[PDB]
């Protein structure tokens, strides 16, 4: 239920289709003559949508009860802070943190000084920084689902859905240098097998 769009819409469909080759390191690369900021912006939006729906499938198993903290494994714990509303990181539940996190990413996506909808308006000079912060924070949603909820992911059959979207995610951030090794440490074991 949606349909015809341009020009970043062809880019999104371009990226979605080219994954069908199964070689994700090639289909992740910047198409010839395409704006780097727009290619990352287009995929960052799609990643946000994908992980929003992946987490939405398991949302009944992630509660204030079974997830009092944001966790990827026992070793890693996330406390939420952004710019101003919350400066010092605050300890909260995994459902509430992801709500903070996804509502925050939406706010950047709806900021036209950041993600301009007019096709002729340059992305800001700091756009690369803003996109790195988005993707590094969305990765943590993969990490929490994999460590805590993977059993629910297999009760539903989303495991192919999640692993294909996660493989696409890692190969994309790796191609463009979008996330530090220190941030991918929780899934590092899975990352090395992919």
């Amino acid at each position: 239920p949606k349909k015809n769009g341009s020009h970043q819409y062809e880019l999104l469909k371009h990226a979605e289709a080219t994954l069908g080759s199964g070689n994700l390191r090639q289909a992740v690369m910047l198409p010839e003559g395409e704006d780097l900021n727009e290619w990352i912006a287009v995929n960052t939006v799609d990643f946000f949508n994908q992980i929003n729906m992946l987490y939405g499938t398991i949302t009944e198993f992630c509660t204030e009860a079974s997830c009092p903290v944001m966790s990827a494994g026992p070793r890693y714990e996330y406390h939420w802070a952004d710019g101003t509303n919350i400066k010092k990181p605050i300890k909260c539940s995994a459902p509430k943190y992801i709500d903070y996190l996804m509502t925050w990413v939406q706010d950047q996506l709806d900021d036209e000084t950041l993600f301009p909808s007019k096709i002729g308006v340059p992305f800001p000079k700091n756009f690369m920084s803003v996109a790195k912060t988005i993707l590094k924070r969305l990765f943590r949603v993969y990490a929490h689902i994999y460590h805590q909820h993977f059993d629910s992911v297999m009760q539903l059959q989303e495991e192919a859905h999640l692993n294909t979207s996660f493989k696409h995610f890692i190969f994309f951030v790796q191609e463009f240098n979008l996330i530090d090794r220190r941030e991918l440490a929780p899934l590092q074991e899975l990352i090395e097998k992919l």
Binding site: Y76, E77, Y78, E183
Partner: peptide, 5 residues
């Protein structure tokens, strides 16, 4: 924002 044990 990110704490480790």
């Amino acid at each position: 924002t990110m704490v480790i044990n």
